[PDB]
Amino acid sequence: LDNGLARTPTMGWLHWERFMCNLDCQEEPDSCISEKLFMEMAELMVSEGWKDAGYEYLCIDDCWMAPQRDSEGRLQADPQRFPHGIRQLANYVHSKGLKLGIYADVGNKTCAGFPGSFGYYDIDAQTFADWGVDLLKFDGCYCDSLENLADGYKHMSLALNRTGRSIVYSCEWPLYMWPFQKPNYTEIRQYCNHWRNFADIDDSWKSIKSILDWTSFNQERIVDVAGPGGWNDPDMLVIGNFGLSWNQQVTQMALWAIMAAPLFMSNDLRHISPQAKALLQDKDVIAINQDPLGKQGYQLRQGDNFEVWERPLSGLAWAVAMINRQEIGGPRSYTIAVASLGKGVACNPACFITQLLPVKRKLGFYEWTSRLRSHINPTGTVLLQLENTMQM
Amino acid sequence: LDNGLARTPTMGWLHWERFMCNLDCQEEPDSCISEKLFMEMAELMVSEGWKDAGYEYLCIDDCWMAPQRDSEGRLQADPQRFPHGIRQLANYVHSKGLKLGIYADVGNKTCAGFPGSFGYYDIDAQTFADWGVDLLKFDGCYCDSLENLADGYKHMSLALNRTGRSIVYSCEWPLYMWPFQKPNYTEIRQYCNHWRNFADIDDSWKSIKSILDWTSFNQERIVDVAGPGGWNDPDMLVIGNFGLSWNQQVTQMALWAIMAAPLFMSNDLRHISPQAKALLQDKDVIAINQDPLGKQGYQLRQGDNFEVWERPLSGLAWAVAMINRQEIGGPRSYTIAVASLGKGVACNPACFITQLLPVKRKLGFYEWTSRLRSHINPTGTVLLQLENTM
Ligand SMILES: *[C@@H]1O[C@H](CO)[C@@H](O[C@@H]2O[C@H](CO)[C@@H](O[C@@H]3O[C@H](CO[C@H]4O[C@H](CO)[C@@H](O)[C@H](O)[C@@H]4O)[C@@H](O)[C@H](O[C@H]4O[C@H](CO)[C@@H](O)[C@H](O)[C@@H]4O)[C@@H]3O)[C@H](O)[C@H]2NC(C)=O)[C@H](O)[C@H]1NC(C)=O
Ligand SMILES: *[C@@H]1O[C@H](CO)[C@@H](O[C@@H]2O[C@H](CO)[C@@H](O[C@@H]3O[C@H](CO)[C@@H](O)[C@H](O[C@H]4O[C@H](CO)[C@@H](O)[C@H](O)[C@@H]4O)[C@@H]3O)[C@H](O)[C@H]2NC(C)=O)[C@H](O)[C@H]1NC(C)=O
Ligand SMILES: *[C@@H]1O[C@H](CO)[C@@H](O[C@@H]2O[C@H](CO)[C@@H](O[C@@H]3O[C@H](CO)[C@@H](O)[C@H](O)[C@@H]3O)[C@H](O)[C@H]2NC(C)=O)[C@H](O)[C@H]1NC(C)=O
Ligand SMILES: *[C@@H]1O[C@H](CO)[C@@H](O[C@@H]2O[C@H](CO)[C@@H](O)[C@H](O)[C@H]2NC(C)=O)[C@H](O)[C@H]1NC(C)=O
Ligand SMILES: *[C@@H]1O[C@H](CO)[C@@H](O[C@@H]2O[C@H](CO)[C@@H](O)[C@H](O)[C@H]2NC(C)=O)[C@H](O)[C@H]1NC(C)=O
Ligand SMILES: O=S1(=O)N[C@@H]2[C@H](O)[C@@H](O)[C@@H](O)[C@@H](CO)[C@@H]2O1
Ligand SMILES: O=S1(=O)N[C@@H]2[C@H](O)[C@@H](O)[C@@H](O)[C@@H](CO)[C@@H]2O1
Ligand SMILES: *[C@@H]1O[C@H](CO)[C@@H](O)[C@H](O)[C@H]1NC(C)=O
């Protein structure tokens, strides 16, 4: 989408994986979808260094809506859980230096059963723009036909455009097409700043493995489509929650940087370990995700429960991720000719190699003819940055 | 098995899950199956508080053997990896106040293809006894019949008894039988101090869940046979490795206590986080696992992706574990009538409840009319101890 937005992958926070559709503010007030939850996340995004690390967008997912449109046929915030309305939340969010995202559905109902946008694309689009919305996530539930799906996504895109407000446009179009026909990614790209390809993440190693395996299986279809203004969305970061070991958290953060993924944390910023915080705020790994070249990485090799992924970066640098998929035993040795990395460009005639994950270690100069030797933890990843150099 | 051992579930360290069959001492001397590995672990079990918490058996799994028996038809330790031999390793482990476990196979080869004990049961028993072995893990690979399986486990049991040495006998008899015919646990217990029921654990949450689901499915058949001298073995603790979140580690420690499981760590005692070490050395939770009554706990209920498990303890106490199997979202609220717990006696007329996991805190006095409300982390467990006021 040539709206001049999302020139790097969008970064921020989205409630869905951690808070889902909790409407019980009486018995579960700390986890219920309310203006107070968003306001509290906003303060913490500022005070706990998230904004400074680049997490800019505070996003509302499903279950923000009143059950019905007003007398004027516009969407309304739930009166009990959002008594001060979207506009005042927007002012609060903007006052802290952040941008607000919100959710809607191309079809007749949101996936949770709240009012769909079909019949109202232009008024809804104008509603968000009046409210001061800076991002829309646009879901595909309750859509009759491929034709409606496509028409709706295309329509809402132009509708948002017509408003003349800068609004990142995040689409689930490809994901709702797979049951019927292969998506056309050149079409999707024209209309959307990023697009969900695969099933919702959850707080599990199984869910990470399943997203990586679908991505590497489908990479010829989707990798070359991605670039400034248009990204593949493999769903939220779940680092800081309950289901992933340290090694599995390092693997998500490493591979979301490789894949030029939007980085939407879905966690509780009020209750997050220092270790999870340091990984999500890791300046050098964010710098790989946010690399201005904006070319998505890929799986170079697979076999013997090892994977090697790489991503080309600005300035003849490469990011390299080595994953140990063996879920038994101890750290496994992997050796590779540095000549096989970065299409033989990265270390010609030499590279300087820095390990970034699991820990930051300068490894030194590797001649084009050198071998790189690593030890990789079970379900973990070693992330390396290869800098092309003349020295040595 | 009435040999006077395993009066509480056996606690120790076993190499298999973390170190496996690493024979490469040239490129990986730190992590290969060698006497240096066992001596490092023995030293740390003393120095790092493991023996004090009750971890007592330092156990060798498969891949310790020379490829062939000796001239005199005996099992030998690989001459390069175990140069001082097992008897001398046993002497060293004994000098630290610990006990030594070793591994053999009832069939023709071990699972990793080293010498089997079929045909050599009496000699193998006497060799282990002579070496000063305090525990045998006896695997079931390369065994052509159920008749040979049964006769081998029974035969090695009697042959160990005949040596005169107190040796804990850990069997894999049920595991190898179950594909073909339902084991008779009353009989297995007559021959075995503990018995593997199910597929090898690995360093994953999928593994843990599969072991718990198998145990709750089979509980009618296995829970009542367990008791002082004879335990269900759901396989090694993998806390301190790579695959489990903090909440999944808590679930393993909590449910291995509820299940009166043997507690065999398979980790690297040289490289273990302080949080993993405090969970494994948790005095209150080990005291549940090690309860002298020795009555295995059981699943009380399942539904809404929650499990409630409970275990009867000495002196009118109960342990209760609440598992959140929902792998999405946040801490989920669960409430149960305290009258539904411990067969209606735990909190009649009242009980004092202490949370032990994931953190210790006194919750206070609950009356027989009360409901216990808890928030449980996804893939986590809340472990409670209930003390009756009488
Ligand atoms: C509604 O939809 C329309 C349809 O596309 C959008 O219009 C486009 O807006 C984008 C983003 O601003 C425009 O892209 C920008 O074009 C600017 C001008 O480019 C022309 O003129 C220069 C002279 O300086 C020529 O050299 C050049 O070849 C072009 O012909 C550039 O200044 C912009 O570049 C800056 O940012 C980009 C990243 O976006 C960087 O690559 C650059 O380094 C630089 O910093 C940019 O290229 C595009 O021209 C518009 N297209 C059309 C058809 O008009 C609306 O923005 C959209 N509105 C909303 C609110 O959604
Ligand atoms: C070989 O097999 C035989 C037959 O099973 C086996 O004999 C059994 O040994 C046990 C334990 O040694 C015997 O039960 C004991 O009886 C004695 C004295 O009469 C008691 O002292 C023992 O327990 C007491 O002490 C414990 C430790 O302090 C206390 O905790 C406990 O409560 C008791 O106070 C125990 O009751 C059992 O009777 C015999 N069985 C027969 C048929 O003789 C022998 O151990 C096996 N040998 C080897 C080497 O495995
Ligand atoms: C360990 O290996 C040996 C040798 O391969 C096994 O002994 C062999 O077992 C087979 C299968 O039971 C025996 O075959 C049987 O032979 C009789 C004839 O005597 C025949 O009537 C049966 O129908 C059957 O074919 C074989 O005789 C026997 N070989 C020897 C050398 O005794 C042994 O059982 C293996 N142990 C285990 C526990 O698997
Ligand atoms: C996928 O959709 C895109 C964009 O709608 C198609 O590209 C254009 O299609 C229009 C209408 O047929 C043509 O006028 C253009 O010449 C096409 N190319 C470009 C770059 O705009 C694309 O052809 C579609 N089908 C595919 C890829 O098979
Ligand atoms: C399971 O095995 C046990 C022990 O081998 C069997 O119980 C024995 O049965 C014999 C014959 O009735 C009696 O002499 C013993 O008194 C029993 N021992 C014990 C400790 O109970 C039992 O019969 C077997 N059950 C089945 C279904 O095979
Ligand atoms: O759970 S869903 O079927 N998946 C959809 C989306 O894919 C999710 O990301 C989230 O936005 C949900 C909101 O209800 C949507 O419903
Ligand atoms: O991996 S195995 O098939 N499982 C068996 C056992 O069940 C394991 O615990 C371990 O002792 C192994 C040693 O070779 C055995 O081989
Ligand atoms: C919404 O419902 C109407 C009324 O049944 C139907 O005609 C229309 O096709 C639906 N829209 C979508 C996008 O599925």
Coordinates of N, CA and C in Angstrom, one line a residue, chain B residues 226-294:
Chain B
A226 N 0.3 -48.5 44.0 CA 1.5 -47.8 44.5 C 1.5 -47.7 46.0
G227 N 2.7 -47.6 46.6 CA 2.8 -47.5 48.1 C 4.3 -47.9 48.4
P228 N 4.6 -47.7 49.7 CA 6.0 -47.9 50.2 C 6.6 -49.2 49.6
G229 N 7.7 -49.2 48.9 CA 8.3 -50.3 48.2 C 8.0 -50.5 46.7
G230 N 7.0 -49.7 46.2 CA 6.6 -49.9 44.8 C 5.8 -48.7 44.2
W231 N 6.4 -48.1 43.2 CA 5.9 -46.8 42.7 C 5.7 -46.8 41.2
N232 N 4.7 -46.1 40.7 CA 4.5 -45.7 39.3 C 5.6 -44.7 38.9
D233 N 6.3 -45.0 37.8 CA 7.4 -44.1 37.3 C 7.0 -43.5 36.0
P234 N 6.6 -42.2 36.1 CA 6.2 -41.4 34.9 C 7.4 -40.7 34.2
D235 N 8.6 -41.1 34.6 CA 9.9 -40.8 34.0 C 10.5 -39.4 34.6
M236 N 11.7 -39.0 34.1 CA 12.6 -38.0 34.7 C 11.9 -36.6 34.8
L237 N 12.3 -35.9 35.8 CA 12.2 -34.4 35.9 C 13.1 -33.8 34.9
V238 N 12.6 -32.9 34.1 CA 13.4 -32.2 33.0 C 13.5 -30.7 33.3
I239 N 13.1 -30.3 34.6 CA 13.3 -29.0 35.1 C 14.7 -28.6 35.0
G240 N 15.1 -27.4 34.6 CA 16.5 -26.9 34.5 C 17.1 -27.1 33.1
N241 N 16.3 -27.6 32.1 CA 16.8 -27.7 30.7 C 16.1 -26.6 29.9
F242 N 15.6 -26.9 28.7 CA 15.5 -25.9 27.6 C 14.0 -25.7 27.1
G243 N 13.2 -26.7 27.3 CA 11.9 -26.9 26.6 C 10.7 -26.4 27.4
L244 N 10.8 -26.2 28.7 CA 9.7 -25.9 29.6 C 9.7 -24.5 30.0
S245 N 8.6 -23.8 29.8 CA 8.4 -22.4 30.5 C 8.5 -22.6 32.0
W246 N 8.5 -21.5 32.8 CA 8.5 -21.6 34.2 C 7.2 -22.3 34.7
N247 N 6.1 -21.9 34.1 CA 4.8 -22.5 34.5 C 4.8 -24.0 34.2
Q248 N 5.4 -24.4 33.1 CA 5.4 -25.9 32.8 C 6.3 -26.6 33.7
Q249 N 7.4 -26.0 34.2 CA 8.3 -26.6 35.2 C 7.6 -26.8 36.5
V250 N 6.8 -25.8 36.9 CA 6.0 -25.8 38.2 C 5.0 -27.0 38.0
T251 N 4.3 -27.1 36.9 CA 3.4 -28.2 36.6 C 4.1 -29.5 36.8
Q252 N 5.3 -29.7 36.3 CA 6.0 -31.0 36.4 C 6.3 -31.3 37.9
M253 N 6.9 -30.3 38.6 CA 7.2 -30.5 40.1 C 6.0 -30.8 40.9
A254 N 4.9 -30.0 40.7 CA 3.6 -30.2 41.4 C 3.1 -31.6 41.2
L255 N 2.9 -32.0 39.9 CA 2.2 -33.3 39.6 C 3.1 -34.5 39.9
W256 N 4.4 -34.4 39.8 CA 5.3 -35.5 40.2 C 5.2 -35.7 41.8
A257 N 4.9 -34.7 42.5 CA 4.7 -34.8 44.0 C 3.3 -35.4 44.2
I258 N 2.3 -35.0 43.5 CA 0.9 -35.6 43.7 C 1.0 -37.0 43.3
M259 N 1.8 -37.4 42.3 CA 1.7 -38.8 41.8 C 2.7 -39.7 42.6
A260 N 3.3 -39.3 43.6 CA 4.3 -40.1 44.4 C 5.2 -40.8 43.4
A261 N 5.7 -40.0 42.5 CA 6.7 -40.4 41.4 C 8.1 -40.4 42.1
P262 N 8.9 -41.4 41.6 CA 10.4 -41.2 41.8 C 10.7 -39.8 41.1
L263 N 11.6 -39.1 41.8 CA 12.2 -37.8 41.4 C 13.6 -38.0 40.9
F264 N 13.8 -38.3 39.6 CA 15.1 -38.4 38.9 C 15.2 -37.2 38.0
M265 N 16.0 -36.2 38.4 CA 16.4 -35.1 37.6 C 17.3 -35.7 36.5
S266 N 17.0 -35.1 35.2 CA 18.0 -35.3 34.1 C 18.3 -33.9 33.6
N267 N 19.3 -33.3 34.2 CA 19.7 -31.9 33.8 C 21.2 -31.8 34.0
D268 N 21.7 -30.6 33.8 CA 23.2 -30.3 33.9 C 23.3 -29.5 35.2
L269 N 23.8 -30.2 36.3 CA 23.9 -29.5 37.6 C 25.0 -28.4 37.6
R270 N 25.8 -28.4 36.5 CA 26.9 -27.4 36.3 C 26.3 -26.1 35.8
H271 N 25.1 -26.2 35.1 CA 24.5 -25.0 34.4 C 23.0 -25.1 34.7
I272 N 22.5 -24.6 35.8 CA 21.1 -24.6 36.2 C 20.8 -23.3 36.8
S273 N 19.7 -22.6 36.3 CA 19.2 -21.3 36.8 C 18.9 -21.4 38.3
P274 N 19.1 -20.3 39.0 CA 18.6 -20.3 40.4 C 17.1 -20.6 40.6
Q275 N 16.2 -20.3 39.7 CA 14.8 -20.5 39.8 C 14.5 -22.0 39.7
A276 N 15.2 -22.7 38.7 CA 15.0 -24.2 38.5 C 15.5 -24.9 39.7
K277 N 16.6 -24.4 40.3 CA 17.3 -25.1 41.5 C 16.4 -24.9 42.7
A278 N 15.8 -23.7 42.9 CA 14.9 -23.5 44.1 C 13.6 -24.4 44.0
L279 N 13.1 -24.5 42.8 CA 11.9 -25.3 42.5 C 12.2 -26.8 42.8
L280 N 13.3 -27.3 42.3 CA 13.7 -28.8 42.5 C 14.1 -29.0 44.0
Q281 N 14.6 -28.0 44.7 CA 15.0 -28.2 46.1 C 13.9 -27.7 47.0
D282 N 12.7 -27.4 46.5 CA 11.6 -26.9 47.3 C 11.2 -28.0 48.4
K283 N 11.6 -27.7 49.7 CA 11.4 -28.5 50.9 C 9.9 -28.9 51.1
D284 N 9.0 -28.0 51.0 CA 7.5 -28.3 51.2 C 7.0 -29.2 50.1
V285 N 7.4 -29.1 48.9 CA 6.9 -29.9 47.7 C 7.5 -31.2 47.8
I286 N 8.8 -31.3 48.1 CA 9.5 -32.6 48.2 C 8.9 -33.4 49.4
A287 N 8.5 -32.7 50.5 CA 7.8 -33.3 51.7 C 6.5 -33.9 51.2
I288 N 5.8 -33.3 50.3 CA 4.6 -34.0 49.7 C 5.0 -35.2 49.0
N289 N 6.0 -35.1 48.1 CA 6.4 -36.3 47.2 C 6.8 -37.4 48.2
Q290 N 7.5 -37.1 49.3 CA 8.2 -38.0 50.2 C 7.3 -38.3 51.4
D291 N 6.0 -38.0 51.3 CA 5.0 -38.3 52.4 C 5.1 -39.8 52.8
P292 N 5.3 -40.1 54.1 CA 5.5 -41.4 54.6 C 4.3 -42.4 54.4
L293 N 3.1 -41.9 54.4 CA 1.9 -42.7 54.1 C 2.1 -43.3 52.7
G294 N 2.6 -42.6 51.7 CA 2.9 -43.3 50.4 C 1.7 -43.6 49.6

